[PDB]
Design an enzyme around this catalytic site. Structure first.
Site, mmCIF file in Angstrom:
data_model
loop_
_atom_site.group_PDB
_atom_site.id
_atom_site.type_symbol
_atom_site.label_atom_id
_atom_site.label_comp_id
_atom_site.label_asym_id
_atom_site.label_seq_id
_atom_site.Cartn_x
_atom_site.Cartn_y
_atom_site.Cartn_z
ATOM 1 C CG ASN A 132 65.155 56.814 -65.986
ATOM 2 O OD1 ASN A 132 64.343 55.914 -66.181
ATOM 3 N ND2 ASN A 132 65.884 57.460 -67.054
ATOM 4 C CG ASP A 170 67.084 53.818 -68.964
ATOM 5 O OD1 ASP A 170 67.995 53.647 -69.755
ATOM 6 O OD2 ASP A 170 65.889 53.911 -69.471
ATOM 7 C CB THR A 175 61.830 62.477 -71.424
ATOM 8 O OG1 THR A 175 60.201 62.618 -71.340
ATOM 9 C CG2 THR A 175 61.952 62.742 -69.992
ATOM 10 N NE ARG A 177 60.534 41.478 -73.040
ATOM 11 C CZ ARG A 177 60.404 40.343 -73.333
ATOM 12 N NH1 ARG A 177 59.289 39.740 -72.828
ATOM 13 N NH2 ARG A 177 61.268 39.621 -74.092
ATOM 14 C CE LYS A 205 62.525 58.758 -68.491
ATOM 15 N NZ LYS A 205 61.993 58.396 -69.807
ATOM 16 C CG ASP A 241 66.569 59.092 -69.814
ATOM 17 O OD1 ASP A 241 65.776 59.927 -70.237
ATOM 18 O OD2 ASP A 241 66.497 57.786 -69.703
HETATM 19 C C1 LIG Z 1 64.954 51.291 -66.222
HETATM 20 N N1 LIG Z 1 63.704 50.831 -65.777
HETATM 21 C C2 LIG Z 1 62.308 50.681 -66.601
HETATM 22 O O1 LIG Z 1 61.395 49.908 -66.132
HETATM 23 C C3 LIG Z 1 62.235 51.764 -67.956
HETATM 24 C C4 LIG Z 1 62.785 50.676 -69.221
HETATM 25 C C5 LIG Z 1 61.907 49.919 -69.768
HETATM 26 C C6 LIG Z 1 62.574 49.282 -70.594
HETATM 27 C C7 LIG Z 1 63.502 49.370 -71.321
HETATM 28 CL CL1 LIG Z 1 64.270 48.559 -72.393
HETATM 29 C C8 LIG Z 1 64.556 50.476 -70.448
HETATM 30 C C9 LIG Z 1 63.940 50.995 -69.558
HETATM 31 N N2 LIG Z 1 60.966 52.137 -68.138
HETATM 32 C C10 LIG Z 1 60.884 53.602 -68.982
HETATM 33 C C11 LIG Z 1 60.280 54.679 -68.496
HETATM 34 C C12 LIG Z 1 59.462 53.918 -67.162
HETATM 35 C C13 LIG Z 1 59.952 52.620 -66.909
HETATM 36 C C14 LIG Z 1 58.827 51.381 -66.914
HETATM 37 O O2 LIG Z 1 58.169 51.124 -68.060
HETATM 38 O O3 LIG Z 1 58.402 51.219 -65.816
#
Ligand SMILES: CNC(=O)[C@@H](c1ccc(Cl)cc1)N1CCC[C@H]1C(=O)O
Ligand SMILES: CNC(=O)[C@@H](c1ccc(Cl)cc1)N1CCC[C@H]1C(=O)O
EC number: 2.7.11.11
Length: 339
Positions: free
Chosen positions: A160, A173, A190, A45, A157, A155
């Protein structure tokens, strides 16, 4: 130009010094107050936190070690942290602290309150070409930097790409980023953004990032990605055909650039030819771009996200708030020794 070559040589020197001697264990969990979950994934998270002594806000990525192991992300998580502590570029979110405990890995990043490009793009529908070009230029420079360090991002997209207080991008990310001097083989990324050579299980190289830039520019300017379909298998068939249909509102220069970035044959793809990134930077679609002024953040951005302050979370969405539990016993100590 020699000035660019010398900039990149210095960038690589500085990266390698941190790469060879990574920082470790630079904060701990009870130095922060938990504020809100900003996003979630399969094994961790991202939470908005506040440092209790300075009051600074950060985006803390929390990865559950046992889930990282089970989903076969050990090396990727070690790549992510080792890379992030070593890089330094205007359009990359900065890693401020990292640490681990019995249960989790933590990467404490600067908090970018403007939200993901994804949200803004979906809200507006599509960006005009100048607006897409402003963001694309930042990605071109960021990939020039990363690739010069032998790093593949893997990655790209809209989720990110965070929009900062000045309207500039900050890439977040690094979970799939890797130092690669040749080819690499892991299936990751993705579906809509995957290059054909990834879908076909080939050894692939930094050209996959330039493919993904083509997908991003198309999606920014159209509002939807070029190989869209309802299920991944159908997306993959469209990608490997590389049959692209461009909206009539695209300029001829945009279509030409995209045909060269979305080139299925990686040996013919812009960014991967003898002239490298300069085939992109010198393309007519970028003729109005002042690369130096973009790098120096002197261009007025197309828009400024609306937010009230460095703690505002209104541009991120709402998730169920779960505990950050830390086991009494150490988990996966061996696997994450170097973190
Ligand atoms: C990089 N920041 C994020 O929030 C990332 C995330 C969340 C959890 C984790 Cl371990 C890694 C990356 N996510 C994934 C895609 C959309 C976004 C979200 O849920 O808003
Ligand atoms: C101080 N800035 C530079 O030396 C470069 C730069 C910056 C970042 C990257 Cl990755 C590569 C190059 N400026 C100078 C001329 C071209 C322009 C550019 O941004 O292309």
């Amino acid at each position: 130009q020699e000035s660019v070559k010398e900039f990149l040589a210095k960038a690589k020197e500085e990266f390698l010094k941190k790469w060879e001697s990574p920082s470790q264990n630079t904060a701990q969990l009870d130095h922060f107050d938990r504020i809100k979950t900003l996003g979630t994934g399969s094994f961790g998270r991202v939470m908005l936190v506040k440092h209790k002594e300075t009051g600074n806000h950060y985006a803390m990525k929390i990865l559950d070690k046992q889930k990282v192991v089970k989903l076969k992300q050990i090396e990727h998580t070690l790549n992510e942290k080792r890379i992030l502590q070593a890089v330094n570029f205007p359009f990359l979110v900065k890693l401020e602290f990292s640490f681990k405990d019995n249960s989790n890995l933590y990467m404490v990043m600067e908090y970018v309150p403007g939200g993901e490009m994804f949200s803004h793009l979906r809200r507006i529908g599509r960006f005009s070409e100048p607006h897409a070009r402003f963001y694309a230029a930042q990605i071109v420079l960021t990939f020039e930097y990363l690739h010069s360090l032998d790093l593949i991002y893997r990655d790209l997209k809209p989720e990110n790409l965070l929009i900062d207080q000045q309207g500039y991008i900050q890439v977040t990310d690094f979970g799939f980023a890797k130092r690669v001097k040749g080819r690499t083989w892991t299936l990751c990324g993705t579906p809509e953004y995957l290059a054909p050579e990834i879908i076909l299980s080939k050894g692939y190289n930094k050209a996959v990032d330039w493919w993904a830039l083509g997908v991003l520019i198309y999606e920014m300017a159209a509002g939807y990605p070029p190989f869209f379909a309802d299920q991944p298998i159908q997306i993959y068939e469209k990608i490997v055909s590389g049959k692209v249909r461009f909206p009539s509102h695209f300029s001829s220069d945009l279509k030409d650039l995209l045909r060269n970035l979305l080139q299925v044959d990686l040996t013919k793809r812009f960014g991967n030819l003898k002239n490298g990134v300069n085939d992109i930077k010198n393309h007519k679609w970028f003729a109005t771009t002042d690369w130096i002024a973009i790098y120096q953040r002197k261009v007025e951005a197309p828009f400024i996200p609306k937010f009230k302050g460095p703690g505002d979370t209104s541009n991120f969405d709402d998730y169920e708030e779960e505990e950050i539990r830390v086991s009494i016993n150490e988990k996966c100590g061996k696997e994450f020794t170097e973190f």
